[PDB]
């Protein structure tokens, strides 16, 4: 025993641990690029979401099944999966002509259907309109999605201090004006944004909104979050456009929206839905089945668009039901972008 020391010197990071058979994906002498793909996430996340995470650590873990991987954050398992290191993943992204043969699976990043296929299958897969993704990329995309999920945690007091200071260099007045705001509130708003995958890369707007509005609402985080989000419609819409340039979404029918609004209650500044067991049931089936269809179309994340008053209440209700959706308000939609309605949820 000499682990008073390893504990003294330990830094906090995201850790990708690889089973024996996955190590070859990291071996550049073998042509694997997992190292660059994994190490290049931190910069992409920085430019898309506006925070700096510590570099991602890559370990072997021999206690793992040889094809399995495990992702840890502060030593706690937050994700795991497997790839066929010597195969390729083929996906229907909405242009498939004829289905091909392979091993069916659920891709780990979003739970979409896919086929593991051999290298020699790639050519015909491509002819049939499939998208092909290699093992390293699958792991990288998974890992990327997991850091987005836990983006909150990387927003420490020291990251907040560092974000202001990095803004101070050429907007020194607004950061100074922001010293008037309790720093727990700023931090708390930033976490609340990242919690729902809203980038904080526009600190100017964030700080300006908080500094303006906070004194008026006793630094209430529910109000500040919504107010800040309302001013980031360009950033929000851009962060959820599909790659074809369209933000693709579901809505609730008017009858359904009215039903939800009728069960909506405010207590202090906290909005919630007052639903019995059967009603909560109807709500969950309706969303989850429609979400299920969106994923089957090769589209993810599943986005729900509602009016301002339902956004937080619905979002809370979803994460408590463990339904992986994004909930957006009308106030957050950039009319300069293209939109596509995928379907309408009926709770009836």
Domain boundaries defined on the chain: 12-155, 156-346
Supply 23's token pair.
Answer: 């190590």
- Cβ count within 10 A of residue 83: 27
Q: Is 169 exposed, middle or buried (0-12, 13-18, 19+ CB in 10 A)?
A: exposed
Sign of CA dihedral 238, 239, 240, 241: positive
Q: Going by C-beta distance under 8 Å and a sequence separation of 6 or more, which residues neighbour residue 10? A: none
End-to-end CA distance of the chain: 62
d(CA 271, CA 317): 11
d(CA 260, CA 252): 9
Cα 43 to Cα 40, 55, 190, 192, 218, distances in angstroms: 6, 9, 19, 22, 36
Cα 182 to Cα 120, 186, 215, distances in angstroms: 60, 7, 10
Three-state SS letters, the chain: CCCHHHHHHCCCCEEEEECHHHHHHCCHHHCCCHHHHHHCHHHHHHHHHCCCCCCCEEEECCCCCCCEEEEEECCEEEEEEECCCCCEEEECCCCCCCCCCCEEEECCCCCCEEEEECHHHHHHHHHCCCEEECHHHHHHHHHHHHHHHCHHHHCCHHHHHHHHHHHHCCCHHHHHHHHHCCHHHHHHHHHHHHHCCCCCCCHHHHHHHHHHHHHHHCCCHHHHHHHHHHCCHHHHHHHHCCCCCEEEEEEECHHHHHHHHHCEEEECCEEEECCCHHHHHHHHHHHHHHHHHHHHCCCCCEEEEECHHHHHHHHHHHHHHCCCEEEEEHHHCCCCCEEEEEEEECCC
Supply 271's token pair.
Answer: 């909005």
d(CA 57, CA 75): 12
d(CA 194, CA 154): 10
d(CA 73, CA 156): 14
Task: Give phi and psi for 227, each to the nearest 5.
Answer: -65, -45
d(CA 251, CA 257): 9
Supply 298's token pair.
Answer: 């090769």
Supply 224's token pair.
Answer: 């500040």
Indicate the length of the chain as a whole number: 348
- Cβ count within 10 A of residue 184: 12
Q: Going by C-beta distance under 8 Å and a sequence separation of 6 or more, which residues neighbour residue 90? A: 100, 102, 114, 115, 116, 117, 121, 122, 125, 130, 131, 132, 133
Cα 240 to Cα 92, 296, 321, distances in angstroms: 20, 18, 22
Q: Going by C-beta distance under 8 Å and a sequence separation of 6 or more, which residues neighbour residue 331? A: 229, 230, 233, 308
Cα 251 to Cα 140, 246, 306, 340, distances in angstroms: 31, 16, 7, 11
Supply 324's token pair.
Answer: 């992986």
Cβ contact 90:117 at 8 Å: yes
Cα 137 to Cα 5, 44, 56, 79, distances in angstroms: 36, 14, 15, 16
Cα 284 to Cα 96, 201, 250, 274, distances in angstroms: 31, 33, 14, 14
Work out whether strand 14-18 and strand 57-60 pair parallel, antiparallel, or are unpaired: parallel
Q: For domain 12-155, give the CATH number.
A: 3.40.30.60
Cα Rg of the chain, angstroms? 22
Cβ contact 152:191 at 8 Å: yes
Torsion angle defined by CA atoms of residues 166, 169, 172 and 176, in that order, rounded to the nearest 10 degrees: 40
Cβ contact 189:155 at 8 Å: no
d(CA 158, CA 185): 15
């Amino acid at each position: 025993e000499e682990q008073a020391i390893d504990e003294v010197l330990k830094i906090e990071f995201l850790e990708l641990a690889l089973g024996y058979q996955l190590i070859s994906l990291a071996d550049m002498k073998q042509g694997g690029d997992l190292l660059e793909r994994i190490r290049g996430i931190r910069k992409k996340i920085a430019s898309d979401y506006g925070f700096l995470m510590p570099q991602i650590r890559i370990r072997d873990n021999l206690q793992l099944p040889p094809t399995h991987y495990e992702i840890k954050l502060k030593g706690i398992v937050i994700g795991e999966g497997m790839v066929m290191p010597d195969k390729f993943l083929a996906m229907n992204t909405g242009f498939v002509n004829r289905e091909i043969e392979g091993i069916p699976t659920k891709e780990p990043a979003f739970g979409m259907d896919a086929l593991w296929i051999d290298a020699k299958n790639k050519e015909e897969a491509i002819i049939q309109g499939y998208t092909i993704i290699d093992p390293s990329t699958v792991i990288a995309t998974h890992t990327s999605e997991l850091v987005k999920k836990y983006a909150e945690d990387f927003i420490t007091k020291d990251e907040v201090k560092s974000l202001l200071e990095r803004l101070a260099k050429d907007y020194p007045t607004i950061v100074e004006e922001s010293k008037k705001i309790p720093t727990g509130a700023i931090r708390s708003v930033l976490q609340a944004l990242l919690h729902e995958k809203i980038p904080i890369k526009d600190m100017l707007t964030i700080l300006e909104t908080i500094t303006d509005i906070a004194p008026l609402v006793q630094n209430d985080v529910n109000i500040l979050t919504e107010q800040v989000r309302a001013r980031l419609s360009r950033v929000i819409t851009n962060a959820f456009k599909s790659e074809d340039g369209r933000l693709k979404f579901l809505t609730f029918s008017t009858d359904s929206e009215q039903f939800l609004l009728n069960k909506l209650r405010e207590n202090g500044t906290s909005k919630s839905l007052l639903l019995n067991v059967g009603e909560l049931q109807k709500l969950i089936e309706g969303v989850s089945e429609e979400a299920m269809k969106v994923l089957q179309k090769g589209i993810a994340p599943v986005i729900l668009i509602v009016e301002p008053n339902l956004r937080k209440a619905l979002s809370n209700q979803m994460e408590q039901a463990r339904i992986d959706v994004v909930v957006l308000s009308h106030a957050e939609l950039d009319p300069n972008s293209n939109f596509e309605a995928l379907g309408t949820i009926h709770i009836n």
